[PDB]
Amino acid sequence: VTAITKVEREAVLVCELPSFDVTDVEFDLFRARESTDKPLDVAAAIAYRLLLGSGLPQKFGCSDEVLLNFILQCRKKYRNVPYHNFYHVVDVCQTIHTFLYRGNVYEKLTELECFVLLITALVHDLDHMGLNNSFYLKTESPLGILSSASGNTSVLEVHHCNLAVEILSDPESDVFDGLEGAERTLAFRSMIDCVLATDMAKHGSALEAFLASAADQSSDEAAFHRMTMEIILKAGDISNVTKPFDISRQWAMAVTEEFYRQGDMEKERGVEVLPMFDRSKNMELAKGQIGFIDFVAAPFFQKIVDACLQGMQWTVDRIKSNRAQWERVLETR
C-alpha cells in the first residue's frame, strides 16, 4: 500500500458539490456522478463531507488528513464492475448516515459505534470482482478452496475484512489510531462482525437474532449494540428499494447487469447458471424488483421499524410506493 499523495487529496478537496445535500434521504449519487467528469473525486468528497459533518472523526483523534488517506486507500481497492464498485459503498455510507441521523438510530449506539458504522460502509465490499460466494465454490476456484479448507463459507466477506485490516495497519490511513485498549478492540471487532454479517446466506438468522434481542428488555446491552450495528450495515446494503423510484431503478439496472455477466462466465465455465443470472431468460425488472420487495426488503424493513427503529418508517413508505409504481409498469404493459 503506497502512501496517498498531496495531489490525490487536492483532487478530492477541490470538489464543492454545489446544491447537493449529502445528509438528505432524497440525495442522488447518480446526478452527483454526472455533475462532473471526475465522478470518483466527487464520490470521495461525498464520503469526506459525510464523515466530517457527523463530527465523529474529530472526537476520536482522526485528523482530516488521515480520514482522506483512508477514503482514498479504500477507493483504490474497488474495481470497475457494474454494481459492487466505489459508488455502491459511498451509497451505503450516505444511506447509513440518514438511518443514524434522520432515522434517529444514533440514539441506540455510542458515538464510537456511529463512527465505526460510517467507516465500515466504505470497506464492506473491498476488491469485489462482480462474482458472488456461490461462483467461487461451484468453480472450485483458489479463494473457494481456501474458504472451504479453513471452514468459512463467507468467501468475499472474509476477503473484504483482510483488506480492511491491511489499510488500517498503516498509521497514515488508520482512522482508529486515536483509539487504544478496549475502544480500539471494539472498533476492529465491530467493523469485522458487521462485514461478516453482510453475507446474505446469514440474512434470516441475523434478522431473527436482532428481533429476539430488541424484544428482550434483559438482552445483554453490548450484544444488542453489536446486532444493531450489523442490522444497520445490512439495512444500507439492501437500501436500493428505499430510494426515490428513478434512483432505485438505476441501482436495479446496475445489479442485474452484474448478475448477467456472472452467468456469462458460469456459461463459458460449464457450471450451473440460475434464472436470475441468465440474459437468455430476459426477465422483467418489474417482476424482479416486486420479488425482492416481497421476499427480502419489505419484511426486513417492516420488522426492524416495528421492533425498534421507529424513526426509519420512511423506508417502509418508499418500498410500499416503489412496489405500487412497478405494479403500474405491469398494469400498463
The conformation of residue 105, written as its DSSP 8-state character, comes to G
**Is the Cβ of residue 52 or residue 129 nearer to Mg ion in the bound state?**
129
3-state SS assignment for residue 194: helix
Contact criterion met (CB below 8 Å) for 22 and 49: yes
d(CA 256, CA 260) in angstroms, rounded, equals 6
d(CA 260, CA 240) in angstroms, rounded, equals 19
**Is the Cβ of residue 4 or residue 96 nearer to Zn ion in the bound state?**
96
Find the binding residues for ligand K3N in span 175-204 (CB under 6 A): 200
Please state the closest distance from residue 121 (CB atom) to Zn ion, in A: 9
101 marked among binding-site residues? no
Of residues 52, 45, 44, 38, the one with CA closest to residue 75: 44
306 marked among binding-site residues? no
Find the binding residues for Zn ion in span 189-228 (CB under 5 A): none
Angle (CA) 232-24-96 rounded to 5° is 15
Contact criterion met (CB below 8 Å) for 273 and 325: no
84 is catalytic: yes
Residue that the C-alpha cell 464492506 belongs to: 124
Please state the closest distance from residue 99 (CB atom) to Mg ion, in A: 18
Q: What is the dihedral of CA 177, 160, 300, 93, to 10 degrees?
A: 50
Q: Does 295 bind ligand K3N (CB under 6 A)?
A: yes
d(CA 221, CA 80) in angstroms, rounded, equals 41
Residue 126 interacting entry, from Mg ion, Zn ion, ligand K3N, none, C-beta within 5 to 8 Å by type: none
Please state the closest distance from residue 124 (CB atom) to Zn ion, in A: 5
Please state the closest distance from residue 257 (CB atom) to ligand K3N, in A: 11
Q: Does 125 bind Zn ion (CB under 5 A)?
A: yes
Angle (CA) 15-21-23 rounded to 5° is 115
Please state the closest distance from residue 160 (CB atom) to ligand K3N, in A: 12
Binding span for ligand K3N by CB under 6 A among 2-10, 54-62, 101-109, 248-256? 248-256
**Is the Cβ of residue 226 or residue 234 nearer to ligand K3N in the bound state?**
234
Q: Does 87 bind ligand K3N (CB under 6 A)?
A: no
How is the chain split among helix, strand and coil, in percent rounded to 5? 70, 0, 30
289 marked among binding-site residues? yes
**Chain centroid to CA 36: how far?**
24
237 marked among binding-site residues? yes
Q: Which residue is nearest to ligand K3N (CB)?
A: 288
Out of 41, 125, 174, 266, which residue is the one contacting Mg ion (CB under 5 A)?
125
295 marked among binding-site residues? no
d(CA 179, CA 231) in angstroms, rounded, equals 24
Encoded one letter per residue, x for contact with Mg ion by CB under 5 A and - for no contact, window 195-234 reads ---x------------------------------------
Q: What is the dihedral of CA 105, 111, 117, 118, to 10 degrees?
A: 100
Q: How many residues bind Mg ion (CB under 5 A)?
A: 2
Q: Does 288 bind ligand K3N (CB under 6 A)?
A: yes
Residue 292 interacting entry, from Mg ion, Zn ion, ligand K3N, none, C-beta within 5 to 8 Å by type: ligand K3N
3-state SS assignment for residue 15: coil
d(CA 208, CA 194) in angstroms, rounded, equals 16
Contact positions toward ligand K3N, by CB under 6 A? 200, 237-238, 240, 251-252, 255-256, 276, 288-289, 291-292, 295-296
| Residues annotated within a binding site for Zn(2+) | 88, 124-125, 237
Give the residue numbers annotated as catalytic, written as ranges.
84
Contact positions toward Zn ion, by CB under 5 A? 125, 237
Contact positions toward Mg ion, by CB under 5 A? 125, 198
| Residues annotated within a binding site for AMP | 84-88, 125, 237, 289
